[PDB]
Scaffold this active site. Structure first.
Site, PDB file in Angstrom:
ATOM      1  N   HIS A  62       0.823  -1.220   0.000  1.00  0.00           N
ATOM      2  CA  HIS A  62       0.000   0.000   0.000  1.00  0.00           C
ATOM      3  C   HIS A  62       0.853   1.266   0.000  1.00  0.00           C
ATOM      4  O   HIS A  62       0.449   2.292  -0.536  1.00  0.00           O
ATOM      5  CB  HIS A  62      -0.935   0.035   1.206  1.00  0.00           C
ATOM      6  N   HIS A  92       5.522   6.874   6.692  1.00  0.00           N
ATOM      7  CA  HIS A  92       5.277   6.461   5.323  1.00  0.00           C
ATOM      8  C   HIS A  92       4.773   7.683   4.568  1.00  0.00           C
ATOM      9  O   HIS A  92       4.545   8.744   5.155  1.00  0.00           O
ATOM     10  CB  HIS A  92       4.252   5.337   5.263  1.00  0.00           C
ATOM     11  N   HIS A  94       2.159   9.057   1.064  1.00  0.00           N
ATOM     12  CA  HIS A  94       1.178   8.861   0.002  1.00  0.00           C
ATOM     13  C   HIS A  94       1.583   9.791  -1.133  1.00  0.00           C
ATOM     14  O   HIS A  94       2.028  10.910  -0.871  1.00  0.00           O
ATOM     15  CB  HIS A  94      -0.242   9.183   0.479  1.00  0.00           C
TER      16      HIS A  94
HETATM   17  C1  TG4 Z   1      -4.147  -6.313  17.349  1.00  0.00           C
HETATM   18  C2  TG4 Z   1      -3.451  -5.527  16.227  1.00  0.00           C
HETATM   19  C3  TG4 Z   1      -4.415  -5.334  15.061  1.00  0.00           C
HETATM   20  C4  TG4 Z   1      -3.643  -4.765  13.824  1.00  0.00           C
HETATM   21  N1  TG4 Z   1      -4.138  -3.477  13.481  1.00  0.00           N
HETATM   22  C5  TG4 Z   1      -3.441  -2.993  12.262  1.00  0.00           C
HETATM   23  C6  TG4 Z   1      -3.777  -1.554  11.968  1.00  0.00           C
HETATM   24  O1  TG4 Z   1      -4.866  -1.068  12.251  1.00  0.00           O
HETATM   25  N2  TG4 Z   1      -2.759  -0.735  11.327  1.00  0.00           N
HETATM   26  C7  TG4 Z   1      -3.027   0.668  11.009  1.00  0.00           C
HETATM   27  C8  TG4 Z   1      -1.833   1.112  10.165  1.00  0.00           C
HETATM   28  C9  TG4 Z   1      -1.997   2.563   9.690  1.00  0.00           C
HETATM   29  C10 TG4 Z   1      -2.872   2.868   8.633  1.00  0.00           C
HETATM   30  C11 TG4 Z   1      -2.985   4.165   8.200  1.00  0.00           C
HETATM   31  C12 TG4 Z   1      -2.246   5.161   8.800  1.00  0.00           C
HETATM   32  S1  TG4 Z   1      -2.388   6.844   8.249  1.00  0.00           S
HETATM   33  N3  TG4 Z   1      -2.324   6.852   6.640  1.00  0.00           N
HETATM   34  O2  TG4 Z   1      -3.680   7.308   8.702  1.00  0.00           O
HETATM   35  O3  TG4 Z   1      -1.253   7.561   8.808  1.00  0.00           O
HETATM   36  C13 TG4 Z   1      -1.357   4.838   9.867  1.00  0.00           C
HETATM   37  C14 TG4 Z   1      -1.250   3.575  10.293  1.00  0.00           C
HETATM   38 ZN    ZN Z   2      -0.764   7.650   5.816  1.00  0.00          ZN
END
Ligand code: TG4
Ligand code: ZN
Ligand code: NA
Length: 258
Positions: A62, A92, A94
């Site tokens: 992703h 990370h 986008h």
């Molecule tokens: C028990 C553990 C369950 C696993 N749970 C995994 C999980 O929910 N991961 C989320 C990862 C993520 C996604 C998007 C962003 S952003 N783009 O908003 O910064 C940041 C972080």
């Molecule tokens: Zn993000």
């Protein structure tokens, strides 16, 4: 999970598996600079990254994540709108297929070429998995990228991308200093929101810096050579991995600056 950013599995589809996609505090949003209000009670941001310990970089299909040791208070975010201490777990980006798109947040409807997310979790919840289940579990520091001059502190990231071209590949990435990705000013906007990818959990205090960083056309070109696919699969360039702006609904965006 079979969600992605294509026509048949992209942001318009996510709600079918993740109904919170249509929730009351979804991210990203458009930041209307004239409607945001200065909040004089907002404390300055405290970014304490001196002891940051990067470990690894991962293509997760992703985006790519630069991961940190978050088993101690080594790199933390405090102050601003936040109560307590938030540990850096990963950052990370986008980005777009073209320089005029790629950011998730927009500013007066302007899209930037990319957006950096430094992801932190609230240490009072003990681990990241617990934190994402809480309304104040995460703080994500968002930084816009525009194309112009190179960002010297980004080049080590750019350099390693050849080694993690495809989904599931990782590489050692120790001794990286995330302070080299920050702009000069820590002026920011803030609002309550969500993860911008599934599971779209409404656990994030967003802190979006007003000042973009500049990266070169060559640096972002190399982001666009990554692949969504795994090795040995048909090549799908990792581009346009952004969610568009979502309805603001019953939220106010606050500014740290006049
Ligand atoms: C028990 C553990 C369950 C696993 N749970 C995994 C999980 O929910 N991961 C989320 C990862 C993520 C996604 C998007 C962003 S952003 N783009 O908003 O910064 C940041 C972080
Ligand atoms: Zn993000
Ligand atoms: Na150029």
């Amino acid at each position: 999970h079979h969600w992605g950013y294509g026509k048949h599995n992209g942001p318009e589809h996510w709600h079918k598996d993740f109904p919170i996609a249509k929730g009351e505090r979804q991210s990203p949003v458009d930041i209307d600079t004239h409607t945001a209000k200065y909040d004089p009670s907002l404390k300055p941001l405290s970014v304490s990254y001196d002891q940051a310990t990067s470990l690894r970089i991962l293509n997760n299909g992703h985006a790519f994540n630069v991961e940190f040791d978050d088993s101690q208070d080594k790199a933390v975010l405090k102050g601003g709108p936040l109560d307590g201490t938030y540990r850096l777990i990963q950052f990370h980006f986008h980005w777009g297929s073209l320089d005029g798109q790629g950011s998730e947040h927009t500013v007066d409807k302007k899209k930037y070429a990319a957006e950096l997310h430094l992801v932190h979790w609230n240490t009072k919840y003990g681990d990241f998995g617990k934190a994402v289940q809480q309304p104040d579990g995460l703080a994500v520091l968002g930084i816009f990228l525009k194309v112009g001059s190179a960002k010297p502190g980004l080049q080590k990231v750019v350099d390693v991308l050849d080694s993690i071209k495809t989904k599931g590949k990782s590489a050692d990435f120790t001794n990286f200093d995330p302070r080299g990705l920050l702009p000069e000013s820590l002026d920011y906007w803030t609002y309550p929101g969500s993860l911008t990818t599934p599971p779209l959990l409404e656990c994030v205090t967003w802190i979006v810096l007003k000042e973009p960083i500049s990266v070169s056309s060559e640096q972002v070109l190399k982001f666009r050579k990554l692949n969504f696919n795994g090795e040995g699969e048909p090549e799908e360039l990792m581009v346009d991995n952004w969610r568009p702006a979502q309805p603001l609904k019953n939220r106010q965006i606050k500014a740290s600056f006049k």
